[PDB]
Design a binder for this molecule. Structure first.
Ligand SMILES: Cc1cn([C@H]2C[C@H](O)[C@@H](COP(=O)(O)OP(=O)(O)OP(=O)(O)O)O2)c(=O)[nH]c1=O
Ligand code: SF4
Ligand SMILES: [Zn+2]
Lengths: 1010, 66
DNA sequence: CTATGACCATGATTACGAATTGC
DNA sequence: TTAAGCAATTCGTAATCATGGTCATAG
């Protein structure tokens, strides 16, 4: 629809180009100037034109040591290494490499690993023509033949085999989303006859570019173009949609320029004639071929930078591609920027111990960038459900019906289009509100990796990139060590608690950035690790090296500076600047998203240390990891000895303090005073006192005062939070307990939060007992919503769940009769509830889908929920304040309240009802019993105040759907399984149905036909 | 039949007769006739040549827990 | 018709494998 | 071709052992 502005008057012999790049690309090419791999770079100007840039003359290489013989110091054998062996038996050694310009170069460099000296050594630099020839050469120089005139006897290892685009960016100092400049007279626009579809197309040599480091005025962001879209399909009853039978009926698109607070384009393309919508364009077609063609032409002409959505990768784009393949439309799958290239669906998997394992499809688009917001949520955030409704409530606050809204009239289709446009608008709001893209651009500028790697890869490519960028400045080469496999080492210490309930303030002192500052201030690195022999026979121990608790020796900083201290120092300053910016916000959600930014930079700095100990990885050095955790243990026991030893009764202070807890970075010391001001004063004195026994940047700091405190086990406690004194209290802290885990029911987590509220804030155990009694009583009397009963568990890799029978695996692998095409896959979460049956050996035989127990009305196992979900967390919490008469107190508060329960041949009942007073079954329909006939005005009085309260609950719920829907004049259709509103509006109809019929036992209060 | 099942499905979604997914089909036909909006005399003449069948004398979504 | 013996099951306790959080 | 690392508390689920209760036989 709307086009980009027109590039007026660029003349290359006088004017430069200044543009900001988004994507890079590799390309094997003809039309050479009179190398074959030429590079592509796509970007945008400071105004809004689209620029493609072709870069020429770059070829991959690596290094290898020159062996000590008469060969690789003699030029005849250098060019003979270039020369091929013409023998017949060298077909395995000069064919797959063959005649390639590997070349011969002599340079003086060093290896990374260890500390041998300040002296370098000769290495050979071996270029290669193509990037897809470094793999057979590696298969032909190490295990292949290297008998060539006795120049290089096998073997010499390969060093610095890295990726092509990463080697380009390490070479020329270009980072992700960078400002690039072509100077005047260096670039030719009309040298390249147009093979792509951008406006400006330059054709430059790889030594002409200028990279501007992002800082000062070069810290801006260009006006990018962002698209979001959503589709609709018309299915059958029960049957989930399938790309060979179910047509695509509506596509809806939203588009904006980045930096402007509203969109500028709003389009909706339908398949029958429709009705107009104010604010958007509407076009209609009588066939699906025109609809797919129209969308492909719009996406070529608008030419967006970024494409977003929600689950567009695994649902939307391959559905469109398969549907275009079935209907024989040849011109659809050309969505990219290159004019002669069609797109294809390709599977990929990712797995780690940090995010688990996920299997995704990818679809190829060259030039353009994809950001599915579902994958960003699934990677960064740990939530309970990952539906669009659930995250839109958590962050903002909100198939067979559609097939008859489309086979109807055109106002129904207009309603369908407004629904689809709201769906297509929600991920834009989430992208701009959560500060996604600004943090992605800052991550790519601090680490130096492209913008497509932050959605596909892990935390290794970034630390490899930063280490290579720091390695070119002193002249070192990286080695290739690979081992399967070493052993584990010893991790962190935890101090033994003094368990219980405390009501005198405890002050928390901890170290900030512990492991990066250990690695900084004792000069630990790959490049300064001293081997056990190379100290000998030199004897200089003092101020030349140090010794660690695991046992290594490491050189002092008066000889070398390591590489990991400098990378860590850069990351630490970036996080410090993020916190300094965060210290001046007032909005809460903005304060937590800047907390998210600084959390991400601290995770990056700690993954630098975790790179070293990963024995399945790219470069492990477990000696360093052992030295780190040994220093950690030594320093925390130093802290505990010092804190408990100095402030004592004989040293003039009030009370000898005693440490109650410590977990590898923090110390919770109990001081003795019950005044929060005096505890805060002594705690600040203690933190600042103890910090002066270390190198720098090692510092201990005061952080909080808990008053009161509740310690249950290791990694399980709770307390109340004081930041200042006249800032009285902030909130609770629930570390580890049953209120922050997601393996349980909402009922149990709510009860634990409410019990700690009534028990820690108001200090009333009697209201707490009465609360827990009411929860258990309302459980047994069958008046608890089934939202509070839903359990969710993650469906991981299928073989571990083959090894032992679980409940959620049994529910998932059991398909439905309605739909063998929508079922949980690997990596998602399965929700279930437990119904009552008589198979007590197996709780995996009583699990059912919440919607299935909704539509089929199966009962609930209240004894399962009473003794297996609720009871034992309560016995954790309520015991330490009292004795074991407290277990008997809650099991007796159960006992006064356990005696009230509510619930083939079962169908042949009714035709009479039991007495309302004393429950005696009898012949006839009158409500009262003949012995309890007198007391009847009181028994009518009783239960009409129950009908009165059910009437008041019907009306508050069924008009809330009208305000959440938007309209007051049309029907509600919302079966949202993540809304408590749904199925709480279903049971009050039946309560009212039952309670209205019980009062017609009594006669009518008058006539009605008068 | 199979042509009489689309006439009723077309009467059920025309907005000028009312917002009807809680009641029967013949009750909505007589409600519009009282106010006399314009009920057509064909959605009546198939609700008379049938008995109490639940796929003629019921709204489209008379399943569906809404 | 009772008493004794055998079988059978059922319930409880202990030991191992698995989602999430602490580092 | 790509992956951040390990220590666990903790509770659930399954299996094994013990204990009694019921039924059938024999005197
Ligand atoms: C959270 C976390 C901690 N650790 C280690 C490194 C840390 O130095 C040590 C302390 O944990 P943390 O206190 O969580 O982190 P931190 O002390 O480095 O930073 P800050 O005080 O500002 O919050 O635990 C990891 O190795 N990986 C991790 O993911
Ligand atoms: S059931 Fe009602 S309140 Fe709940 S989400 Fe649906 S429309 Fe909104
Ligand atoms: Zn009675």
């Amino acid at each position: 629809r709307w086009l980009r502005p027109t590039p007026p008057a660029l003349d290359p012999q006088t004017e430069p180009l200044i543009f900001q790049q988004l994507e890079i690309d590799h390309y094997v090419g003809p039309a050479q100037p009179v190398s074959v791999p030429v590079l592509r770079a796509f970007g945008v100007t400071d105004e809004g034109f689209s620029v493609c840039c072709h870069i020429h003359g770059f070829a991959p290489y690596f290094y290898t040591p020159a062996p000590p013989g008469f060969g690789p110091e003699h030029m005849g054998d250098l060019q003979r290494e270039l020369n091929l062996a013409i023998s017949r038996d060298s077909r395995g050694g000069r064919e797959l490499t063959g005649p390639a310009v590997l070349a011969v170069e002599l340079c003086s460099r060093e290896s990374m690993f260890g500390y041998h000296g300040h002296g370098p050594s000769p290495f050979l630099r071996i270029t290669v023509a193509l990037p897809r020839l470094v793999a057979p050469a590696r298969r032909l120089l190490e295990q292949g033949i290297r008998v060539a005139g006795l120049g290089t006897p096998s073997f010499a290892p390969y060093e610095a085999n890295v990726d092509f685009e990463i080697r380009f960016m390490v070479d020329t100092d270009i980072v992700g989303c960078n400002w690039l400049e072509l100077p005047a007279g260096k670039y030719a626009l009309r040298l390249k006859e147009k093979a792509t579809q951008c406006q400006l197309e330059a054709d430059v040599l790889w030594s002409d570019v200028v990279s501007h480091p992002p800082e000062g005025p070069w810290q801006r962001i260009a006006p990018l173009r962002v698209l979001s879209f959503d589709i609709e399909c018309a299915g059958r009853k029960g049957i989930f949609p399938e790309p060979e039978r179910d047509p695509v009926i509506q596509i809806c698109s939203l588009g904006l320029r980045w930096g402007e607070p509203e969109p500028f384009l709003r389009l909706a393309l339908t398949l029958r004639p429709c009705a107009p919508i104010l604010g958007a364009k509407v076009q209609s077609y009588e066939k699906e071929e025109d609809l797919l063609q129209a969308w492909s032409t719009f996406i070529r002409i608008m030419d967006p930078d970024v494409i977003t959505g929600y689950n567009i990768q695994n649902f939307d784009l391959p559905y469109l591609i398969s549907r275009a393949q079935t209907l024989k439309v040849q011109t659809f799958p050309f969505l990219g920027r290159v004019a002669g290239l069609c797109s294809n669906i390709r599977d990929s998997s990712f797995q780690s111990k940090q995010t688990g394992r996920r299997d995704t499809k990818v679809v190829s688009m060259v030039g353009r960038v994809q950001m599915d917001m579902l994958q960003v949520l699934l990677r960064e955030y740990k939530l309970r459900s990952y539906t669009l409704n659930a995250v839109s409530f958590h962050f903002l606050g909100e198939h067979s019906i559609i097939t008859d809204l489309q086979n109807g009239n055109d106002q129904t289709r207009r309603r369908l289009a407004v629904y689809c446009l709201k769906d297509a608008y929600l991920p834009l709001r989430l992208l701009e509100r959560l500060m996604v893209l600004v943090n992605a651009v800052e991550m790519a500028r601090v680490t130096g990796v492209p913008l497509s790697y932050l959605l596909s890869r892990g935390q290794q490519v970034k630390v490899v990139s930063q280490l290579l960028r720091q390695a070119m400045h002193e002249g070192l080469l990286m080695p290739v060590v690979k081992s399967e496999g070493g052993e584990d080492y010893t991790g962190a210490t935890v101090i033994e608690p003094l368990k219980g309930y405390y009501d005198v303030p405890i002050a928390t002192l901890d170290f900030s950035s512990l492991y990066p500052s250990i690695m900084m201030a004792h000069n630990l690195c790959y490049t300064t690790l001293l081997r056990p022999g190379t100290a000998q026979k030199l004897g200089l121990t003092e101020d030349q090296f140090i010794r660690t608790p695991t046992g290594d020796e490491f050189v002092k900083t008066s000889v070398r500076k390591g590489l990991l201290p400098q990378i860590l120092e850069n990351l630490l300053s970036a996080r410090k600047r993020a916190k300094a910016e965060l210290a001046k916000e007032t909005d809460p959600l903005r304060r937590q998203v800047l907390d998210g930014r600084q959390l991400a930079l601290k995770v990056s700095a700690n993954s630098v240390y975790g790179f070293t100990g990963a024995q399945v990885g790219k470069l492990p050095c477990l000696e360093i990891s052992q030295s780190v955790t040994g220093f950690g243990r030594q320093m925390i026991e130093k802290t505990k000895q010092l804190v408990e030893s100095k402030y004592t009764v004989e040293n003039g202070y009030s009370t000898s303090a005693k440490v109650v807890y410590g977990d590898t970075d923090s110390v919770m010391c109990r001081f003795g005073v019950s005044s929060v001001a005096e505890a805060m004063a002594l705690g600040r004195e203690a933190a600042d006192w103890v910090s002066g026994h270390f190198p720098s940047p090692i510092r201990l700091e005061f952080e909080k005062v808990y008053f009161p405190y509740l310690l249950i086990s290791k990694k399980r406690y709770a307390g109340l939070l004081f930041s200042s004194r006249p800032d009285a209290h902030d909130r609770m802290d629930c570390k580890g307990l049953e209120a922050v885990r997601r393996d349980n029911c909402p009922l149990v987590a709510n009860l634990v939060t409410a019990s700690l509220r009534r028990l820690l804030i108001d200090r009333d155990p009697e209201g707490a007992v009465a609360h827990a009694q009411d929860v258990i009583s309302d459980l047994l009397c069958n008046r608890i919503d089934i939202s509070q009963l839903v359990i969710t568990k993650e469906l991981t890799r299928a073989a571990s769940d083959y090894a032992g029978k679980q409940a959620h695996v049994e529910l998932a692998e059991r398909m439905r009769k309605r739909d063998p095409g929508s079922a949980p896959s690997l990596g998602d979460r399965v929700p279930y509830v437990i119904i009552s049956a008589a198979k007590g050996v197996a709780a995996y035989m009583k699990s059912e889908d919440p919607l299935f127990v909704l539509e089929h009305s199966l009962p609930i196992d209240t004894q399962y929920y009473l003794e297996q979900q609720l009871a034992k967390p309560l016995l954790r919490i309520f015991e330490p304040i009292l004795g074991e008469g407290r277990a008997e107190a809650v099991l007796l508060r159960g006992d006064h309240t356990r005696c009230k329960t509510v619930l083939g041949l079962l169908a042949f009942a009714k035709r009479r009802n039991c007495c309302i007073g004393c429950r005696t079954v009898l012949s006839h329909q009158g409500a009262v019993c003949e012995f309890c006939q007198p007391r009847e005005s009181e028994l009518y009085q009783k239960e009409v105040s129950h009908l009165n309260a059910l009437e008041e609950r019907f009306s508050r719920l069924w008009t809330q759907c009208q305000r959440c829907q938007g309209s007051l004049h049309e029907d509600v259709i919302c079966t949202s399984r993540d809304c408590p509103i749904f199925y709480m509006r279903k049971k009050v109809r039946k309560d009212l149905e039952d309670q209205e019929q019980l009062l017609r036992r009594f006669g009518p209060p008058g006539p009605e036909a008068w | 039949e199979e042509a009489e099942l689309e006439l009723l499905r077309q009467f059920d979604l025309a907005w000028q007769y009312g917002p009807c997914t809680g009641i029967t089909r013949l009750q909505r036909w007589c409600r519009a006739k009282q106010m006399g909006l314009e009920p057509p005399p064909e959605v009546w003449q198939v609700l008379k040549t049938h008995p109490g069948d639940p796929r003629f004398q019921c709204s489209l979504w008379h399943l569906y827990p809404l």
